[PDB]
Structure 1
Amino acid sequence: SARIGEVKRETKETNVSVKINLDGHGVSDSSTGIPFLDHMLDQLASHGLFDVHVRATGDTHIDDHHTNEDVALAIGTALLKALGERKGINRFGDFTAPLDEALIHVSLDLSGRPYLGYNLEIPTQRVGTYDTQLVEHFFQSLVNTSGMTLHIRQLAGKNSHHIIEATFKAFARALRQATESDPRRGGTIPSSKGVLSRS
């Protein structure tokens, strides 16, 4: 059966609902209140083949920050739930994607241990109305609740939209690879220590 994770998360700042199918067909269904983020989440669906359902509202008159963070936190938890015990999966993903002059390498391990390595240098402060500092925060928050080791490396790029979008494409492909079935491992846990856990 398809691996589906669902999360609802409300604070005084934001209200978020997420449903992710790891075994999806690339259904894009994201409405966060942050249009640029929606476009990025569409890459996650289109290139990762995840079914991505996201709804969020929040205090965007203060900053897109809280919405951005809370969407990411909920996506991470949805991934954690969908992944379960992580039996039989590839576990590791590794992909470098361009978008024109931009080139972004993403490597990840569905380890249970959160870590973000990130070196993007996005040369403008706003892409549309979206604060480009929020890209790093999206990935940091997602790693923290998913229990993912994630490295994002900027190999080339100048246009801020190209840099960010190449990142989401590379991430989508790496995460697709990591979450997919390993055809040789016979459903075993892919760890020498016998378990993968966020604790």
Structure 2
Amino acid sequence: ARIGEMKRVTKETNVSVKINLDGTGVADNSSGIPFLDHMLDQLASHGLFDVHVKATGDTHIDDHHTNEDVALAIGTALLQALGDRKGINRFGNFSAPLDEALVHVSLDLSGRPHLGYDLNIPTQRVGKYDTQLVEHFFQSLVNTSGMTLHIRQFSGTNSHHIIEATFKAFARALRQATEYDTRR
């Protein structure tokens, strides 16, 4: 079983993250951003990962500093759990429909960080969550994990449906890339 963990203390945030690639879908997420916790639970259920996030920070100013630090910690823990990446598929593709929304995700674990972001979120706030942080979350994740990620939206009107369809497609594409190849 491949397991990654990370702990970082700064002047703004305290974050502890644990990821298990060979899991059954256990989700224990508790940060100061309730909507981000809803998103991280879908990554565990649809990807069959074990995700544990504990974070506290200066949310009285904004959610920006907490959102950025959580994404960096998840990316670092993913890199250490992967190790040498020998015998894995390294490629993942998935399209996820959610009512009127449809998002396609293509990723490859290569060591070269790149993000291709094409999303059109109509509203500025979903709950208390600022929708500009969706791009910032995925940009910080690929900078520490060294992955190439492409996200494209084909349809969608509702802000909740578009974002939560994106996390479903990312979880299942990451699962396919991390499974061992059966060779011939």
Give the TM-score normalised by structure 1.
Answer: 0.91
Task: Find the counterpart in structure 2 of residue 189 from structure 1.
Answer: none
Task: Find the counterpart in structure 2 of residue 29 from structure 1.
Answer: 28
Task: Find the counterpart in structure 1 of residue 88 from structure 2.
Answer: 89
Distance 2:13 2:145 in 1: 20
Residues 1:72 and 2:41 aligned together: no
| Per-residue deviation, 1:60 | 1.0
Task: Find the counterpart in structure 2 of residue 61 from structure 1.
Answer: 60
Gaps of at least 5 residues in structure 1 are 186-199
Distance 1:24 1:149 in 2: 24
Distance 1:75 1:14 in 2: 14
Distance 1:53 1:67 in 2: 16
Q: Identity of paired residues, percent? A: 89
Residues 1:5 and 2:4 aligned together: yes
Residues 1:110 and 2:96 aligned together: no
Distance 1:32 1:100 in 2: 29
SS in 1 for 2:59: coil
Residues 1:123 and 2:122 aligned together: yes
Moved over 3 A (4+): none
| Per-residue deviation, 1:10 | 1.4
SS in 1 for 2:36: helix
| Per-residue deviation, 1:62 | 1.1
Gaps of at least 5 residues in structure 2 are none
Q: Show CA shifts across 1:132-180 (max 9, x none).
A: 1101111000000011100011111111110000000000000001111
Task: Find the counterpart in structure 1 of residue 161 from structure 2.
Answer: 162
Task: Find the counterpart in structure 2 of residue 148 from structure 1.
Answer: 147
| Per-residue deviation, 1:13 | 1.1
SS in 2 for 1:154: strand
For the aligned residue pairs, the C-alpha RMSD in angstroms reads 0.8
Equivalent AA in structure 1 for residue 64 of structure 2: H
| Per-residue deviation, 1:72 | 0.4
SS in 2 for 1:7: strand
SS in 1 for 2:120: coil
Equivalent AA in structure 1 for residue 137 of structure 2: F
SS in 2 for 1:125: coil
